[PDB]
Amino acid sequence: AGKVEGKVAFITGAARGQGRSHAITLAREGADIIAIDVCKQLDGVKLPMSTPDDLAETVRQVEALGRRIIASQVDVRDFDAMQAAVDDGVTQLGRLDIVLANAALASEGTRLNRMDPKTWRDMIDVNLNGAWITARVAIPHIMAGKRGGSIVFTSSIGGLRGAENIGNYIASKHGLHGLMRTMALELGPRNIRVNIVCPSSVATPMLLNEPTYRMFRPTVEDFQVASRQMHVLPIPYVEPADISNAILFLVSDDARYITGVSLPVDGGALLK
Amino acid sequence: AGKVEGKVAFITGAARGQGRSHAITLAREGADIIAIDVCKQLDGVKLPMSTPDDLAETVRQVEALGRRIIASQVDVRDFDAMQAAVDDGVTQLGRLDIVLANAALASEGTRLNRMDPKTWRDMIDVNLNGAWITARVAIPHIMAGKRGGSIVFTSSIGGLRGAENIGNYIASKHGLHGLMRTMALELGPRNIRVNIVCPSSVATPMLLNEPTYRMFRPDLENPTVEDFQVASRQMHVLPIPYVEPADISNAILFLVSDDARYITGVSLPVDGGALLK
Amino acid sequence: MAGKVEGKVAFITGAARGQGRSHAITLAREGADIIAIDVCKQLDGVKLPMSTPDDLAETVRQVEALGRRIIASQVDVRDFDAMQAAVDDGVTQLGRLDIVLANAALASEGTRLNRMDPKTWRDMIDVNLNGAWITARVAIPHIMAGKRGGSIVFTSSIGGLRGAENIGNYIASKHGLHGLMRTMALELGPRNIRVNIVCPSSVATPMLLNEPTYRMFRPDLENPTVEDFQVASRQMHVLPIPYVEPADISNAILFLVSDDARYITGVSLPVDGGALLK
Amino acid sequence: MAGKVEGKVAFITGAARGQGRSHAITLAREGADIIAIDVCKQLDGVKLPMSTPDDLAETVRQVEALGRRIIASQVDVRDFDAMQAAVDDGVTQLGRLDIVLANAALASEGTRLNRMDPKTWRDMIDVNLNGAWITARVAIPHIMAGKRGGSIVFTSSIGGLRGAENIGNYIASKHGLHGLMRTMALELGPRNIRVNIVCPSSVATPMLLNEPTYRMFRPDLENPTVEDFQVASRQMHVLPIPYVEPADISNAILFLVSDDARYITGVSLPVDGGALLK
Ligand SMILES: NC(=O)c1ccc[n+]([C@@H]2O[C@H](COP(=O)([O-])OP(=O)(O)OC[C@H]3O[C@@H](n4cnc5c(N)ncnc54)[C@H](O)[C@@H]3O)[C@@H](O)[C@H]2O)c1
Ligand SMILES: NC(=O)c1ccc[n+]([C@@H]2O[C@H](COP(=O)([O-])OP(=O)(O)OC[C@H]3O[C@@H](n4cnc5c(N)ncnc54)[C@H](O)[C@@H]3O)[C@@H](O)[C@H]2O)c1
Ligand SMILES: NC(=O)c1ccc[n+]([C@@H]2O[C@H](COP(=O)([O-])OP(=O)(O)OC[C@H]3O[C@@H](n4cnc5c(N)ncnc54)[C@H](O)[C@@H]3O)[C@@H](O)[C@H]2O)c1
Ligand SMILES: NC(=O)c1ccc[n+]([C@@H]2O[C@H](COP(=O)([O-])OP(=O)(O)OC[C@H]3O[C@@H](n4cnc5c(N)ncnc54)[C@H](O)[C@@H]3O)[C@@H](O)[C@H]2O)c1
C-alpha cells in the first residue's frame, strides 16, 4: 500500500523537471495523475521550454508504473482551459485529492528600476495568478470528495527573501505565501491542508543553463563553486527528488495536521 | 526647519484617507508634493471612491501650509500616465526624494475557491503591479538627484498574515514584501532606502463603511460602527479599534527623516499589537 | 528490510513519557538504538506531576519489545557533568551517536512576567534553553567522531514563534532555541550535521492535559473540564482539532532525520494544525 | 517646545557608555529624567575593558549639562535585589517611571557551541536574557502604578533574528528577547504599555571597535585593521556603511517612546543598513 494509494493529484508544469519528478513519485506511491504543461515557447522566454513530446514522456513514465494519467497542454494563465482540464480529468479519474502548483517562469533578470511593465506583469501572471487559478479550478473537486486533501504551492527561498536582478520572480513568490495562508485558513475546516515548499536551487533546466551560470559570475563547475557558497550543507543545489520527497511527506498521513507552513528544502541557504 | 525641508514626495492615492494625511504631514514638515489619485469610480468596486473634488481638497490643504503641490488624476496601473505625472512633477518642482506607494483597492470579500479571475487579477494589478509602477517611474529621478531618497510601500498586517474572504488583497500585500526586499537590495548602494509600513485597521472610508461592519460582525443583521468597534478592539492588543491616518503618517515621517537614515528593508507594523495574536 | 534510521543511535532527552517516549519507540521501530534520559523526579517548585522512574522503565520496555537496545538513565539536563557522563557511557555501549532529540522541558506555572520571582524565571530558562544547549553540546563530539554526519532536532513550540500571556518564561526559553538552532546549523552544516526545530501547537501529553492548563485556556469558566478546554483549543487551531498526538510530532521528526530530508537544515517546522495562521 | 519625552522618566541599563549613554543624553535632551545603572566592573571571563565608575560619572555629567536629573548607580542586571533597590530609589527621587531601555549586555568571546563550556554559555544568557527580564520585571510595577501607560524597549541585534558562527550564546540570548518582548507586549498592552525591540546590525561603540572583533570579521587576515574590518562590514550591509552610530539607535528609540509611535507595540525594528536583507 503506497502513501497516496487510490488518490488523484493535479500537477502543473508536469512536462519535465520537478513537475515530472512529482508525477512519478506520487504515481510510484499509488496516485493517478492529472498533468498539465503549457508545452510551447512563450514570447520573451530565452531558454528552451517544454515540448508536447516532453509531456508525453512524463505520461509514458507514469503509465510504466501502472497508473493512469490524463495530460494536456494548458497555460496556467488560461482560466477556462484550466477549468476544462481539471474538470475532464476528474470526470475520467473520479476524484481529486492533491494539487501541486509547480508551473513557473524564471526571471530573465533586469533591475526593477529598469524593467518594463510587460516583463513584470507576465511573471506575476504566470507565477502568482496562475498558481491561484490552479487551486481555484481544483478546490471544488477536492471539496466534492468530502475526504479533505492537500494543496502544495512551490515557492522558492526567494519567496522568503529578496535577490537582486530577479525582483518580479521574488515578488511573485512572496505573493504565494499570502495565497497559501488565506487558502489554508479558508479550507482548514474542510480538512484541506495548504502548504508551501521553498527550494533553494534544483537541478532542472530552469537552473542548469548558461544564462544562470553567467548570473552567478562560466562552465557548470564555475557555477557549482559559487552555488556551494550559498549553501550551508556542502551542496550546489538539491535534486528534483528532494522536493518530491518533501511533498510526499506533506501529502501523506504522517503529515495529516501540518498546514499553513513554508518548508525550505535549501541546504541551509536561508541561514545566511 | 522641518524634517523633510526642501524635499519632494510623490504620493499615490493622495485624494483622501491616508494618502491625504501623508501629503499634509510631509507638507507641514517642509516637503512639496506630487499627488496622484484615480478620482474615478472603478468598475467592480461597490464603495464610493475619491472624486476630483477630493483631490482638489488635498491640494487646498497643502497650499494652505505654504507648500507647492502638483496634482493629477492617474490610475496606478497606467504605466505611461504614471511616467508622465512623475516626470512633470519633477520638472515643475526640481527633484524627487520620497515615494509613498499608498493607493490600493479593498477586497469586497469572496472565498478564493469561488472568486472570478477578473476579481483576482484587478486586485493584484492595482495593489501589487501598481505599487511596482509607482516606484519604477520615480526611481530614475531619485537616482539623478544623487542625494539618496526613501521609498515606502503601504502594506497591511495582511501582508504578513492571511485572512478569510480577502485573499486577493492578502496575496497582493504579501507580494509587496518581496518587491520591497529586492528594491532595497538593488537601490541600497545608491543610498535609496526602501521600507514598508503595515497598518492594522485605519479610520478612513476604506474601513468605516457598512460592508466592513458586516464582515467584522457576520453574526448581526445591521451591525453599527459600535458593533464593529467591539469586534475590532478584540483584534488589537492596545485598547483601540483602529489607528488614525495620522499614526501611519507619523511612522512614515520617521522613516523618511534623517532620524531613520540607516533603516532599510524593514516592515514596520503600526497595528496596536494585532500581529501578536 | 531496513527502517528509516536502521543502525543509527538516537540520544533523546525527556524520554520517560509523552513526546520523548513516542520518539524513542518510533525511531526504535525504524531501526535505531536509543540513549534515553529523563530526570524522573519532581523538581523544586514544579506544580505539575513530572515523570517517575517507573515511567522511564515503561519507555525501556516498549523499546526493547521492538528488538532494539536502549541505555536509559536518570539525568537532569541542567547537570553538565552528568549529561556528559550519560552520553559518553551510552556511546561506549552502543558505539556511535547519530541523532539528538532535545525534547525535555518544563511547562510554565502561569505567572505574569511583571509578578514572576527570579527563581521561576531562571529555572525555566535553565531547563528549556540551557539544558537544550547542554544536550547538543555533550552529543556533538560523538556525532563528529562518527564521520557520517547526523541530525539534531530541538523541540520548540508555536510559543517559540509567537508570544502568549501567562507563560512568558517558557515563551522566552523556546524563542532562545531558534537562535541556538540557527548557529548550530551554521556551525555544523559543513560537517553534514543537520539541525532543525519542530514547533508543535498543543500535544496530548500530561504537560497539556491537566486542570491548571484547562483553567488557563478557559478564564471565562470557574472550573473547566477537559471538554471545555478542547472547545477553546479547537477554536485556536485551523484544522478543527484540540491538539496533535505525540505520534504526529514523532512522524515529523522521523521525516527530518531520514534520508528523504537529507538536505533540510535550519528549519522550524510547525506541526500545529495551522494555529500559527491566526 | 516641550521635548518628545517632556516630564517623563526613563530607566536605562548599561548607561555608562556606548548606546546606553547615547539613549540617556538623547532622552534627556527631549525632556526626560534618568535612572541609570551600569555594572562598572570587569566581569570574569570578559577580555576587553568594560565600563568604569568614571564612564558612568561622564554620562551623569552630560545629562546634568542638559539640565535634567539623573540618579546613577553601580548595579549588575543579574542582581535582582540590587536592581529592585535601584529602580525603587530612582522612582522615589524622580517621582514616576514611564520608559525602560534594557540595553546592558555582554558580547560573545567567540567559541563554537560544540566546544563552549557551560559557564561561558550560562553567564551570557544570565546577563543578556535573564538580566533583561530582571530589568523589565523591577520597573513594570512603577509604570503600571502611574496609570499613564509607557514603553519598554529591549535592545536585541540582527543576531536576534538570524544565526552566526562562533557567537551562539549571544545569538540564543538575543533570540530569547523576542519571546520576552512578545509576551510582555501581550500582557501589558491593555494597560497601554508598549513593548518593542530594536535590532542594530553593528554599532560604533567599544563592543564593536576592537581587535578581536576585527579578527572575527576578517578571519582571512593576519592582524586586521579597523579599515579591514570596515571593508568586510560594509559588504554585509546594503547601505554603503560599515556600522551605525549610537545616535541612530537612540533616534529609533526616541521615535518608539514618543507620542508619534503611540500605537506601535510587539515590533522588532532593525536599524541595520539592510544587513538582514542578505
Ligand atoms: N530550478 C530551480 O532552481 C528552482 C528554485 C526554486 C524554485 N523553483 C520553482 O520550482 C518550480 C518548478 O520549476 P523547475 O525547476 O521544475 O523548472 P522547469 O523549467 O524544468 O519546469 C517548469 C515547468 O513549468 C512549465 N510552465 C511554465 N510556464 C507555464 C504556464 N504559463 N502554464 C503551464 N505550464 C508552464 C514549463 O513548461 C516547465 O515544463 C517552479 O515554481 C520554479 O519557480 C525552481
Ligand atoms: N483603511 C484600512 O483599514 C487599511 C488597513 C490596512 C492597510 N490599508 C492600506 O492603506 C493604504 C491607504 O488606504 P486608505 O485607508 O487611505 O483608503 P482610502 O480608500 O481612503 O484611500 C485609498 C485611495 O487610493 C485611491 N486609489 C485606489 N485605486 C487607485 C488606482 N488604481 N490608481 C490611483 N489611485 C487609486 C483611491 O481613490 C483612494 O483615494 C492602502 O494601501 C490600503 O490597502 C488600509
Ligand atoms: N504538551 C504540549 O502541549 C507541548 C506543546 C508545545 C511544545 N511542547 C514541548 O514538547 C516537548 C516534550 O514535552 P511533552 O509534551 O512530552 O511533556 P511531558 O511533560 O509529558 O514530557 C517532558 C519530559 O521531560 C522531562 N524533564 C523535564 N525537565 C527535565 C530536566 N531538567 N532534565 C531531564 N528531563 C526533564 C519530564 O520528566 C518529562 O518526562 C517539550 O519540549 C515541551 O516544551 C509541548
Ligand atoms: N555594538 C554593536 O555592534 C552591537 C550590535 C548589535 C547589538 N548590540 C547590543 O547593543 C546594546 C548596547 O551595547 P553597546 O554597543 O553600547 O556596548 P558597550 O559594551 O559599549 O555597552 C554595554 C554597557 O553595558 C554594561 N553592562 C554589561 N554587562 C552588564 C551587567 N551584567 N549589568 C549591568 N551593566 C552591564 C557595560 O559595562 C557597558 O557599559 C547591547 O544590548 C548589545 O548586545 C550591539
Residue numbers in the entry:
A (entry chain D): 2 to 218, 224 to 278
B (entry chain B): 2 to 278
C (entry chain A), D (entry chain C): 1 to 278
Excerpt from the paper describing this PDB structure:
With the exception of the M. thermoresistibile target which did not contain NAD, all other mycobacterial SDR target crystal structures contained NAD, which appears to have co-purified with the protein after expression in E. coli. For each of these crystal structures, the adenosine mononucleotide portion of the cofactor binding site is enveloped by the inserted residues and only a portion of the nicotinamide ring appears open to solvent (see representative examples in Fig. 2A and B). In addition to the insertion loop which covers the adenosine portion of the cofactor, a second loop which typically contains two α-helices covers much of nicotinamide mononucleotide portion of the cofactor. In contrast, this loop is ordered in each of the mycobacterial SDR crystal structures presented here. The combination of the insertion loop which covers the adenosine portion of the cofactor and the ordering of the second loop which covers the nicotinamide mononucleotide portion of the cofactor results in a significant decrease in the solvent accessible surface area of the cofactor in the mycobacterial SDRs, relative to other NAD- and NADP-dependent dehydrogenases. Only a small portion of the nicotinamide ring appears available to solvent in each of these cases, indicating that the NAD cofactor is tightly bound and potentially non-exchangeable. The structures presented here have a cofactor solvent accessible surface area of approximately 18 Å2, whereas other NAD- or NADP-bound dehydrogenases have a cofactor solvent accessible surface area of 82–89 Å2. Given the encapsulation of the NAD cofactor by the two loops in mycobacterial SDRs, a large conformational change would be required to release the NADH cofactor after a redox reaction had occurred. To test whether or not the bound NAD was exchangeable, we performed a number of line broadening and STD-NMR ligand-observe studies, and did not observe exchange of NAD/NADH during the timescale of the NMR experiments.
Here we present a series of TIGR03971 SDR crystal structures from several mycobacterial species which contain an insertion in the primary sequence at the NAD cofactor binding site. These crystal structures demonstrate that the inserted protein residues almost completely cover the NAD cofactor, only leaving part of the nicotinamide ring exposed to solvent. NMR experiments did not show exchange of the NAD cofactor, whereas binding was demonstrated for a number of small molecules which could be potential substrates, products, inhibitors, or artificial redox partners. Experimental results are consistent with the notion that the SDR family enzymes linked by comparative genomics studies to mycofactocin do indeed keep their NAD tightly bound beneath a protein structure that may interact with a specialized adaptor machinery for redox exchange.
